[PDB]
Amino acid sequence: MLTRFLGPRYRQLARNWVPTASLWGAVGAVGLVWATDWRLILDWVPYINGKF
Amino acid sequence: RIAEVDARVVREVCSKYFYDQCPAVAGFGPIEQLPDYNRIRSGMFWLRF
Amino acid sequence: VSASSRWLEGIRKWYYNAAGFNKLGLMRDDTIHENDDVKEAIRRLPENLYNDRVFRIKRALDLSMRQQILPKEQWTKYEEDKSYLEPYLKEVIRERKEREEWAKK
Amino acid sequence: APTLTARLYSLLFRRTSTFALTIVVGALFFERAFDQGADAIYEHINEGKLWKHIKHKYEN
Amino acid sequence: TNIRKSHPLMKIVNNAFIDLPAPSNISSWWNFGSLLGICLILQILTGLFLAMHYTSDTTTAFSSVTHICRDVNYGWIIRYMHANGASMFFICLYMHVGRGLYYGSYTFLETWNIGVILLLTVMATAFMGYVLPWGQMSFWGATVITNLLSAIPYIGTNLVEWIWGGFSVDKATLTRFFAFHFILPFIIMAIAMVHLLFLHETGSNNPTGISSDVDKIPFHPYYTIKDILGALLLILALMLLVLFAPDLLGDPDNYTPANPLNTPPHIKPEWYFLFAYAILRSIPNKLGGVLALAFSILILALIPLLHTSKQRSMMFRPLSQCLFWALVADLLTLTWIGGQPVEHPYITIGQLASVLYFLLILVLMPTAGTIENKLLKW
Numbered sequence: 001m002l003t004r005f006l007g008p009r010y011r012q013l014a015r016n017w018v019p020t021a022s023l024w025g026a027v028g029a030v031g032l033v034w035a036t037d038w039r040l041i042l043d044w045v046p047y048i049n050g051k052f
Numbered sequence: 053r054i055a056e057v058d059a060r061v062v063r064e065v066c067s068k069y070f071y072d073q074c075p076a077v078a079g080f081g082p083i084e085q086l087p088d089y090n091r092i093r094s095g096m097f098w099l100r101f
Numbered sequence: 102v103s104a105s106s107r108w109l110e111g112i113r114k115w116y117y118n119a120a121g122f123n124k125l126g127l128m129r130d131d132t133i134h135e136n137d138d139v140k141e142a143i144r145r146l147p148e149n150l151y152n153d154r155v156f157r158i159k160r161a162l163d164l165s166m167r168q169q170i171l172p173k174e175q176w177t178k179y180e181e182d183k184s185y186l187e188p189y190l191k192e193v194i195r196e197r198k199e200r201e202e203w204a205k206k
Numbered sequence: 207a208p209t210l211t212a213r214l215y216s217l218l219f220r221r222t223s224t225f226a227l228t229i230v231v232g233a234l235f236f237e238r239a240f241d242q243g244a245d246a247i248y249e250h251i252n253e254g255k256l257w258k259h260i261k262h263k264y265e266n
Numbered sequence: 267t268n269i270r271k272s273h274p275l276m277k278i279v280n281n282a283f284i285d286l287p288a289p290s291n292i293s294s295w296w297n298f299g300s301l302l303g304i305c306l307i308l309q310i311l312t313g314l315f316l317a318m319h320y321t322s323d324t325t326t327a328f329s330s331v332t333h334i335c336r337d338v339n340y341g342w343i344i345r346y347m348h349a350n351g352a353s354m355f356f357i358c359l360y361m362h363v364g365r366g367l368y369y370g371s372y373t374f375l376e377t378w379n380i381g382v383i384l385l386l387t388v389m390a391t392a393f394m395g396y397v398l399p400w401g402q403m404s405f406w407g408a409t410v411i412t413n414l415l416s417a418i419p420y421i422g423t424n425l426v427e428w429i430w431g432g433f434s435v436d437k438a439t440l441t442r443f444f445a446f447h448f449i450l451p452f453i454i455m456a457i458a459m460v461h462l463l464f465l466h467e468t469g470s471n472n473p474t475g476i477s478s479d480v481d482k483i484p485f486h487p488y489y490t491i492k493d494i495l496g497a498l499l500l501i502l503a504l505m506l507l508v509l510f511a512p513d514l515l516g517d518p519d520n521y522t523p524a525n526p527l528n529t530p531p532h533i534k535p536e537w538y539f540l541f542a543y544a545i546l547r548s549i550p551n552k553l554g555g556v557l558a559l560a561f562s563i564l565i566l567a568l569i570p571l572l573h574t575s576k577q578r579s580m581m582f583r584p585l586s587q588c589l590f591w592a593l594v595a596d597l598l599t600l601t602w603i604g605g606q607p608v609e610h611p612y613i614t615i616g617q618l619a620s621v622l623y624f625l626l627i628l629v630l631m632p633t634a635g636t637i638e639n640k641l642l643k644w
């Protein structure tokens with residue numbers, strides 16, 4: 001019941017902080033793919049594809 | 053001039069002049085607890101941002 | 102003058118130069134190991150001598166950090182090194198031994 | 207700005223999220239580059255000794 | 267305000283690692299204590315992955331280790347890392363002890379004694395580990411150490427039989443040695459927590475030997491980066507041993523299966539016990555030899571009592587420095603002698619080295635301290 005956080009200030013703060021959250025999500029995704037050696041995604045990358 | 057300032061302008065100017073800058077520090081008196089210069093310098097940015 | 106005293110003076114001067122604490126600008130009493138007696142003796146010092154001791158120790162620690170030594174003209178002279186912590190430590194030890202002697206009875 | 211390091215700072219190293227993204231991408235490419243280089247050097251030093259060099263003789 | 271300084275759990279870490287005041291001039295010799303923190307954890311990791319493939323049965327122990335070497339994926343790397351980590355641990359440990367002895371760190375009596383306990387525990391763990399492969403040297407080292415307690419009068423045979431769990435070294439001995447080897451590192455880590463705890467109250471020492479409250483700096487970022495550099499150098503040396511000379515510090519004879527009947531003619535222990543093996547061979551007497559072996563290790567507990575100098579550290583004490591390096595050379599001499607057969611002239615050299623060792627520790631160091639006290643006129 002977190003209804004305290006519905007106002008102009010919080011949507012403004014969310015707008016400010018969206019890009020950093022997206023970049024951290026991208027960092028997590030790329031790290032997971034690199035760590036697991038997931039061939040499904042990596043086979044489409046041009047220079048990486050030659051390692052298989 | 054004052055009426056033309058908004059949140060975006062303040063953010064950009066402050067990021068220009070404060071963020072990740074080397075400051076100058078002066079202390080006088082019982083200042084044994086003043087942090088080291090490396091700690092003050094590292095406090096000028098955030099890892100979350 | 103005594104020949105034995107001359108040999109003792111020569112050996113003491115040689116050992117003073119060999120110890121090497123003078124190269125960091127310290128005095129002999131700066132290098133004493135601090136225990137309860139020495140802690141009380143240092144606590145009894147006047148202001149100027151205490152501040153001089155603090156600065157000398159701080160400079161020596163910085164030189165030790167940087168692996169340097171002073172130039173040869175700033176080294177402490179053996180003849181001018183006069184002990185400043187003698188009477189205070191002497192009196193503190195005297196009082197402690199008096200307390201022990203009373204405790205024996 | 208003309209200098210390469212100034213461009214790298216103003217483009218990538220300001221934020222920390224971009225710093226981390228740069229690090230992971232660099233690791234991803236550096237893995238393949240280093241592996242190929244090391245394998246090439248090791249194969250050249252020991253030419254005519256490894257199994258893959260004498261493999262063609264026996265298998266039809 | 268700051269969660270780091272008020273959270274119940276992060277406050278301990280903040281006061282232990284991040285905001286700790288440390289001296290500004292501690293040299294590289296202070297890194298070894300941190301390195302012993304790393305190596306221990308390393309042995310806990312690699313060893314924990316060897317326990318997933320090891321079986322303690324006497325008929326299937328050598329075979330299990332060879333299965334680990336040959337069949338497990340990258341198992342040879344883990345095996346030889348765990349094998350050489352012992353040598354790295356003991357090098358770091360002896361450097362730690364020498365650092366404490368040279369710079370007068372033994373005046374912290376509690377930390378010094380807890381360290382002596384840690385030294386004994388680590389020695390026991392290293393010895394019990396070397397038996398699990400079940401080769402020749404494993405068998406004939408377990409036999410000798412277990413018989414070492416037979417010298418105690420009136421209870422020796424019973425204690426020997428109880429430790430063996432039988433009339434000889436056999437399956438029960440191997441199984442219980444495996445259990446103790448598994449469990450003892452956790453006790454070592456628990457005691458090391460106390461080793462740190464007793465040092466937190468008094469602060470750390472510096473090479474000058476003078477109190478350094480005037481010059482202090484935070485532990486982070488200054489000694490975290492030095493810790494990283496020291497860890498990197500340690501990993502370099504360990505991997506050099508693992509990848510370019512896997513059997514330099516080992517023994518060939520432990521690659522044969524254990525034979526209860528035969529004995530090799532050139533038995534010797536690992537390189538980090540040979541000095542004790544040099545002392546015990548010197549005395550031609552069983553109880554006397556065992557007592558000399560015990561006292562050569564337990565003499566570190568009496569080091570604080572023999573201090574007689576006005577200056578804490580040997581930085582300003584040339585005679586003490588000369589005697590210290592003579593002691594180190596004598597330990598090297600004993601380590602050289604322990605790897606040789608008992609024959610002329612090595613017997614005389616070993617006896618003289620042991621006499622010199624005890625005389626240097628007990629007699630000459632306090633005498634030099636008193637002489638230096640008289641030279642400085644105090």
Ligand code: HEM
Nearest residue numbers: 309310313314316317320349352392395396398399448451
């Ligand atoms: C301070 C911690 C430790 C030290 C100094 C140590 C030392 C040793 C040594 C010197 C060996 C002989 C290796 C050889 O000669 O090939 C060994 C073997 C072994 N250790 Fe440890 N060890 C430690 C912790 C552990 C732990 C925590 C475990 C398991 C949980 C473990 C499991 C084993 C096993 C299974 C072997 C026999 C397998 C082999 O020969 O490689 N060790 N250890």
Ligand code: HEM
Nearest residue numbers: 296299300302303363366371378381382384385458470471
């Ligand atoms: C597994 C065993 C051990 C571990 C993990 C360990 C770890 C540490 C650590 C982390 C420190 C603080 C950092 C430093 O001063 O370098 C330290 C300090 C110290 N340790 Fe150890 N240590 C061990 C064994 C020993 C032994 C065997 C001794 C002595 C016989 C000893 C005596 C000392 C002393 C005196 C200090 C304080 C040094 C000073 O500040 O003057 N420790 N140890």
Ligand SMILES: Cc1c(-c2ccc(Cc3ccc(OC(F)(F)F)cc3)cc2)[nH]c2cc(Cl)ccc2c1=O
Nearest residue numbers: 386389390393406407410533534535539542543546
């Ligand atoms: C004296 C001696 C040793 C020897 C063994 C161990 C040590 C050190 C030690 C001492 C005690 C210890 O247990 C304790 F820590 F107290 F729990 C663990 C290790 C020193 C020497 N090991 C040999 C091994 C072979 Cl194969 C043959 C002969 C010898 C030989 O004559």
